[PDB]
Design a protein around this ligand. Sequence first.
Ligand code: CL
Ligand code: CL
Ligand code: CL
Ligand code: CL
Ligand code: CL
Ligand code: CL
Ligand code: CL
Lengths: 101, 100, 85, 84
Amino acid sequence: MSLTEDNNNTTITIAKGENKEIILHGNPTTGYSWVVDSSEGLSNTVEYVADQHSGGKYHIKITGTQTGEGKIVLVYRRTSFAEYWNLLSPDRTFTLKVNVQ
Amino acid sequence: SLTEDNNNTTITIAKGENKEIILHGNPTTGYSWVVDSSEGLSNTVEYVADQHSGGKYHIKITGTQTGEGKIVLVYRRTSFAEYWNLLSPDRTFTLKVNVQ
Amino acid sequence: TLVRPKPLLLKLLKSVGAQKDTYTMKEVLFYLGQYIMTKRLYDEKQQHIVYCSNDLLGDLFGVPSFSVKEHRKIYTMIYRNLVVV
Amino acid sequence: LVRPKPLLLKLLKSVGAQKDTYTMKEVLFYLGQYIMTKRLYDEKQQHIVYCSNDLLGDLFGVPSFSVKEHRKIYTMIYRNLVVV
Ligand SMILES: [Cl-]
Ligand SMILES: [Cl-]
Ligand SMILES: [Cl-]
Ligand SMILES: [Cl-]
Ligand SMILES: [Cl-]
Ligand SMILES: [Cl-]
Ligand SMILES: [Cl-]
């Protein structure tokens, strides 16, 4: 039904528009959280759900959005001081919206 | 081709159609143009030095999915902190997903 | 954008290896980051939070702590501690 | 859990380390602190660390090294500690 840590580095099949759920234990009181590092062919949502009876579980709901070989990579990370401080000085950016017809 | 003139605009291409973005950069500084994100599009990035100083980054994109796509490029230089952080790799979760 | 840091900020910048009286804003931000990194003033679990109530930095910013996420607040506090040339 | 040999220990302590026994994660943290504080990395290619005129150079036995070479760095660190 749902994927967990044991499904790490495997391949699954889903229908375009079908939802599936990944559940991973996490403890955000440390400052770490599960975040989507990259994906392809999918949309997603990430939610933290506290264990009601340390830490809790991240629910990453994926939905197949384009037919083909997709992928999702999640990382358990904590943003560093250096990363926050770097953001005070923004890099030159080029942004282009593209309507694909 | 598209240039800095087209920054922060919207275009409309057909699925499978290609477009080229050309941006000036100077990798001798350690900076380069890199793709920050690329929804609905595939891309390639190539640097060509000005033979006649820096040069031009050629970012070729192709519409790979019908819908509202977007690419964001950043002119950046990887910091020491970013390099050093990778010596202590974060736990990762990876799932290949064949969408039918 | 060239700036001359007021005396507290100048003392902070020189404590981490700066040797000038005039700086670019890029340099000011760099040395201020060096300072916070070196003295590990940031919170380990939430590393955008900087504790400085017992520090020279707290004196010149006039706060017990601040968040690096609040960009305009940061720039405001820095600007109050320099004069543009 | 590791025990840094004297020269490595001296480096870590010069940037705030207090103890004698560490995890590798901690050793890597203070080594990073050290390199950043003394600004030994190259400005344009920040993975390059110049240490030929620094005690880190003596310790690692190199004029410079690249942060991209992960195995090499772990190796140089391991040579300078005892695995407790
Ligand atoms: Cl598999
Ligand atoms: Cl830093
Ligand atoms: Cl001066
Ligand atoms: Cl937070
Ligand atoms: Cl505020
Ligand atoms: Cl100890
Ligand atoms: Cl390089």
